[PDB]
């Protein structure tokens, strides 16, 4: 419905293990009660949900692949278990539910490159 802006880095490298952590900051209209954050994979011109979490108070964000906690405007995200096939464009989608109204923010994408040893 109503929209807000989501910023995230364009390119992120993995570690040898498969650690790809980035920051997803959203231009919040204000301080919200329920915020649902979602990570989306555009690897093959197709969308696949990866993370999915929601918190109904201040900074109590607790997510499987995704380890990460939220700090106000910025959610600190980490993705484990990345193979070279996991390479793709990851979109951080932020939904703030309550209080009304509904604000939706779609990030341009974080291209994560993963190789394997």
């Amino acid at each position: 419905c109503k929209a807000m802006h989501v910023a995230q880095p364009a390119v992120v490298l993995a570690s040898s293990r498969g650690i790809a952590s980035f920051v997803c900051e959203y231009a919040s209209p204000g301080k919200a009660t329920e915020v649902r954050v979602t990570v989306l994979r555009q690897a093959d011109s197709q969308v696949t949900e990866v993370c999915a979490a929601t918190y109904m108070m201040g900074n109590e964000l607790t997510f499987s692949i995704c380890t990460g906690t939220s700090s106000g405007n910025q959610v600190n995200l980490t993705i484990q278990g990345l193979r070279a096939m996991d390479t793709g464009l990851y979109i951080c989608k932020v939904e703030l539910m309550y209080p009304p109204p509904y604000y939706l923010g779609i990030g341009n994408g974080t291209q994560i490159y993963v190789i394997d040893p």
């Epitope: 919040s28 204000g30 301080k31 106000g72 405007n73 209080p99 009304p100 109204p101």
Partner: antibody
Framework: QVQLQESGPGLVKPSQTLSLTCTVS?????????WNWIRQHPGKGLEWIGY???????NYNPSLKSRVTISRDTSKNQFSLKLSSVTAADTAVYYC???????????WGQGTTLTVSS | DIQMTQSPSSLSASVGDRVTITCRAS??????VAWYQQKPGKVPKPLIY???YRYSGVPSRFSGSGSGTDFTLTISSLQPEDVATYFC?????????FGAGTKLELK
């Protein structure tokens, strides 16, 4: 687009009850946002009086909790301020502004000017 | 409450300069700070929200900076239309508090 228009008396004698109405158009109070009242003293900063939400919920500044009542008329799309036992310290320019829950003031009314004089 | 101390109280500047207005929060508020432009005899107009994002329609010369307790509003290239009074504002903890205001003079 969302428009807010203040309305009220020019002057208020001391110890009266102050009444202003903020007529909102192009958006409905009951849908979702928090609707605030703000005054600005001559020569000082901006003071936040309080709000009323879509939910009917109220919160007022602890400085002005006892002297302030903010009420709304759902049919007319208005939310009004009631400030009682006024003093000369209440001479200010009064604004009504839209807000998200603890957020930036998305829209403002033109603001109305009120003088506490005898 | 939470006190937002705004500096400078009033400044003088010529067109083309770069002016910075500071607003020091007595307590940490994170990124929940906004900047508003009140023109002389006019309505306040929101410029900066979330401490770094321009309101829809704000020219690019306006930029918001700051982290934690210190916040700055920056005009890259000053213009005649920008002569106004600028206010900072928190939205992390009720009650909401503004700054004392900073006034712009054309030198």
């Amino acid at each position: 687009q969302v428009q807010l228009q203040e309305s009220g008396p020019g002057l208020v004698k001391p110890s009266q009850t102050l009444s202003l109405t903020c007529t909102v158009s192009a958006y409905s109070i009951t849908s979702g946002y928090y609707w605030n009242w703000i005054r600005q003293h001559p020569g000082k900063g901006l003071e936040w009086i309080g709000y009323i939400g879509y939910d009917g919920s109220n919160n007022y500044n602890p400085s002005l909790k006892s002297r302030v009542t903010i009420s709304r008329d759902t049919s007319k799309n208005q939310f009004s301020l009631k400030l009682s036992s006024v003093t000369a310290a209440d001479t200010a320019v009064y604004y009504c502004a839209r807000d998200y829950y603890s957020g930036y003031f998305d829209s403002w009314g033109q603001g109305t000017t009120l003088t506490v004089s005898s | 409450d939470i006190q937002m101390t705004q500096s400078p109280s009033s400044l003088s500047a010529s067109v083309g300069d770069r002016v910075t207005i500071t607003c020091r929060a007595s307590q940490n508020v994170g990124t929940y700070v906004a900047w508003y432009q009140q023109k002389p005899g006019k309505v306040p107009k929101p410029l900066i929200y979330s401490t770094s994002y321009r309101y829809s329609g704000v020219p690019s010369r306006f930029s918001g900076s700051g982290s934690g307790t210190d916040f700055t509003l920056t005009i890259s290239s000053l213009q005649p239309e920008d002569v106004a009074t600028y206010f900072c504002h928190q939205y992390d903890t009720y009650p909401l508090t503004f700054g004392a205001g900073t006034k712009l003079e054309l030198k």
